[PDB]
Design a protein around this ligand. Structure first.
Ligand code: HEM
Ligand code: HEM
Ligand code: HEM
Ligand code: HEM
Lengths: 146, 141, 141, 146
């Protein structure tokens, strides 16, 4: 997690303008539509057969909000992402059996969703800073797999 | 594979890109060089600074090639033939890098096309870029 | 892609493997599980301890499927059509993991067939496992 | 480098038996045969037309020994691979322009060479320890790319 002061500021800047309720819903939704493979983990969310069924599914929106909340916690502890995410790491491994490769996919759809929402604000230097963050969060979620 | 709906979605999206395509390709390369520095290793003979003409110029060629791929969406492997020999055999670009450029194009289009980049279209463009990446990479070691 | 000389190297090496294929398969799985623990996420319902019967058993299935692929080198998609559906559509295994099992298989053969594992044969077997993987992941999303 | 002490010990013992002249040449040799891409960086080395040409090339052999020499240095420094390989990193990035993905290829070719030479004694557990080493070395070589 090589984040200069300017990256950190840029990241935190932008994040304060993020409506997490809605951004988490869009992010987990788009993940499940763009990468149908990641639907094997949410069979209980009911119907995911089309784009609208997925994006508007209330269980998807609620879950997405949980995910983004954890993400939020991580941004308040950038210098200790492994400790902060350690219990979530063992869960996704031990109980949920999630291949960590999926963490990078979600990380990338989140970058696109941020770009979608912020347009010309999501400049290259800012995207570059969020790419470091999403990579760090995925490695920290990966750290306790065994 | 690219289904009918997918093809329609890609034609309408690229359609709306229009004359702004070169500039988008150009921003896509800048995003890539900055977010994923390893990719610069393929462009040492280039001036890689903000606003560089060589990057603008290269962005245009990348976009023209993508327009041509959409124009020949049903025969991409033969239409991108020359580009496949260049990337896989002359240049030997490792496939991970295509994923990084594809991600960066999706970010560029998302940032410039709010109303067209719905979920469904997003999935289609992602599928299209993967197909194009597979063609450009299939003879590689 | 596979050349006649590759095809020849692969039949030769594999023909020596012969009756050991099952043990080699199981060995390669155990190597993968210890070296790359994230692969264990696709087998939550297996006893994965050393010596395990499920692993051995699974080892023969995989080794048998490569046996069928060598024999059908000239038309793998058709011969592997059923396993491709299973890995790409039902199990949905991320392509990354295929490179990990291929590497471990190469390590196993290298460790068991010192005399046959020449550089050219290494090359062939590598291109072969990569084509099998391509066929087993074409459809993945 | 998260090596358990019984892992450092497995790595160490095997390495003490490695004939560098053979292994270093075989690994470098196999990299260029099995992944002809990598040939673009060694044009100054001569005839790489064919597998036999490659495994007989004395420039390939000498450079292999040198590569294994650096790998020996990181093994003697597992706790600080980043500092140990910092200069090599700047070199592979600023002077030669090698895509770091290529470091994994050499690491894995290198593991198949050890298995080829040690056979039975290269058991799954020994392999896993070496996989960790070889990833830490790759990561260390990539750390100063900018
Ligand atoms: C940024 C990455 C991620 C974060 C921060 C995250 C966070 C969380 C959180 C907070 C929960 C609730 C945990 C609990 O129930 O105690 C959870 C549950 C879960 N996560 Fe993740 N997750 C991430 C990525 C993913 C990915 C990519 C997948 C699979 C594609 C996934 C699969 C699941 C599943 C299946 C559950 C249980 C859902 C249920 O209640 O049925 N997660 N995750
Ligand atoms: C969507 C995928 C891509 C497409 C459509 C594409 C297209 C093109 C085109 C049209 C050219 C110029 C052909 C010419 O002027 O002769 C080119 C050249 C080149 N491409 Fe790509 N490219 C793609 C991905 C990549 C990536 C992933 C890399 C490496 C990260 C890369 C590196 C290069 C390099 C180094 C050249 C030579 C440029 C020069 O020296 O002038 N390309 N590509
Ligand atoms: C050379 C590449 C591979 C081949 C040839 C192969 C072959 C097979 C075969 C023959 C089966 C049994 C199908 C049946 O029951 O009839 C199977 C099942 C399965 N494969 Fe693979 N496989 C390969 C790679 C992988 C990879 C990389 C993974 C993920 C790490 C994987 C995960 C699975 C799983 C989870 C099953 C289901 C096992 C069960 O439910 O008992 N395979 N594969
Ligand atoms: C395990 C990872 C690797 C290590 C530890 C390593 C180590 C070294 C060392 C010690 C040198 C000599 C530096 C000098 O001139 O003083 C070197 C040079 C070089 N390396 Fe690497 N190398 C690695 C992987 C690779 C990769 C995979 C490639 C390309 C595929 C590569 C390409 C080169 C080239 C072109 C040179 C200069 C060769 C010459 O003298 O002409 N290296 N490397």
């Amino acid at each position: 997690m090589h984040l200069t002061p300017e990256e950190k500021s840029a990241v935190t800047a932008l994040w304060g303008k993020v409506n997490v309720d809605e951004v988490g819903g869009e992010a987990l939704g788009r993940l499940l539509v763009v990468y149908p493979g990641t639907q094997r983990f949410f069979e209980s969310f009911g119907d995911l057969s089309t784009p609208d069924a997925v994006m508007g599914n209330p269980k998807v929106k609620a879950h997405g909000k949980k995910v983004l909340g954890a993400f939020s916690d991580g941004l308040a502890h950038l210098d200790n992402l492994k400790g902060t995410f350690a219990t979530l790491s063992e869960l996704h491994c031990d109980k949920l059996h999630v291949d960590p490769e999926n963490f990078r996919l979600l990380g990338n759809v989140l970058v696109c969703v941020l770009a979608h929402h912020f347009g010309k604000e999501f400049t290259p230097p800012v995207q570059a800073a969020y790419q470091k963050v999403v990579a760090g969060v995925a490695n920290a979620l990966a750290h306790k797999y065994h | 594979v690219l289904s009918p709906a997918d093809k329609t979605n890609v034609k309408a999206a690229w359609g709306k890109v229009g004359a702004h395509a070169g500039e988008y390709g150009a921003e896509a390369l800048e995003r890539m060089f900055l977010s994923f520095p390893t990719t610069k290793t393929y462009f040492p003979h280039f001036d890689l600074s903000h606003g560089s003409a060589q990057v603008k110029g290269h962005g245009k060629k990348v976009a023209d090639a993508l327009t041509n791929a959409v124009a020949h969406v049903d025969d991409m492997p033969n239409a991108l033939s020359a580009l496949s020999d260049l990337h896989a055999h002359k240049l030997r670009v490792d496939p991970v890098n295509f994923k990084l450029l594809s991600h960066c194009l999706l970010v560029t289009l998302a940032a410039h096309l709010p109303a067209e980049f719905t979920p469904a279209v997003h999935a289609s463009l992602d599928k299209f870029l993967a197909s194009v990446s597979t063609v450009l990479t299939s003879k590689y070691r």
